[PDB]
């Protein structure tokens, strides 16, 4: 009754490669701050509905109760949007590729009050990825951990406990997958453990930025500079 448990290391990476969302486009065409944050938020709102299908399609995820999936996702959403974007802008130093036709310089983030600090952390982060030459089959593992790890200790019975351990079970499988990949690329044990860590230690950075981007996002809605979708509202209100 848990056959995400009976996946092979490669049926996994191929399952996750298979779920990958499409790369959405900006409908962008003077740059206002409400103009561009209009842009980034209608982009993110589109992004979110694709993310939900890709969530359903992360092995082990639909085994979870509906209320548990909800929370994992309102806890994990902006993190996921960022790691995706950071992967996107990997082969674009200095620039953030939100959409194929919306590649913002680390300077155009000045166009929204205090947006630039966040730009920079994202920029720092992809610069990290780039420099450790992160692979695409790792990225999808990273991306799956994030959805599963982010909201799992905010659970709070006997049955709700087995969920935690279920999802901890799959999380240990995604570790085995990550490490299989590194064995395969010919990394010594030591290089394996050490890089495993490197990858997992940046996920805290991602979480930092998510936290920080969520209070910017919130201060933005409050002085009403651009209208948020309804889903986007919900995603935000859940953090507060």
């Amino acid at each position: 009754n848990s056959l995400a448990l009976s996946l092979t290391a490669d049926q996994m990476v191929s399952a996750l490669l298979d779920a990958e969302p499409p790369i959405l486009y900006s409908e962008y065409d003077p740059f206002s701050e409400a103009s561009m944050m209009g842009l980034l938020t209608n982009l993110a709102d589109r992004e979110l509905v694709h993310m939900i299908n890709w969530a359903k399609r992360v092995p082990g995820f639909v085994d979870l109760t509906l209320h548990d999936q909800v929370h994992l996702l309102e806890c994990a959403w902006l993190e996921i949007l960022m790691i995706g974007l950071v992967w996107r802008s990997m082969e674009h130093p200095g620039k953030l590729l939100f959409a194929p036709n919306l590649l913002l310089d680390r300077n155009q983030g000045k166009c929204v009050e205090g947006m630039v600090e966040i730009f920079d952390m994202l920029l720092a982060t992809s610069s990290r990825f780039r420099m450790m030459n992160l692979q695409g089959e790792e990225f999808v593992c990273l991306k799956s951990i994030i959805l599963l790890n982010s909201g799992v200790y905010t659970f709070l019975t006997l049955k709700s406990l087995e969920e935690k351990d279920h999802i901890h079970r799959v999380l240990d499988k995604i570790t085995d997958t990550l490490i299989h990949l590194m064995a395969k690329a010919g990394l010594t044990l030591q290089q394996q453990h050490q890089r495993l860590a490197q990858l997992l230690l940046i996920l805290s950075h991602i979480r930092h930025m998510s936290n920080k981007g969520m209070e910017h996002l919130y201060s933005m809605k409050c002085k009403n500079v651009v209208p948020l979708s309804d889903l986007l509202l919900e995603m935000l209100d859940a953090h507060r």
Partner: peptide, 9 residues
């Protein structure tokens, strides 16, 4: 909730 709907759909 919107997300709730989106999950079952």
């Amino acid at each position: 909730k919107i997300l709730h709907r989106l999950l079952q759909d």
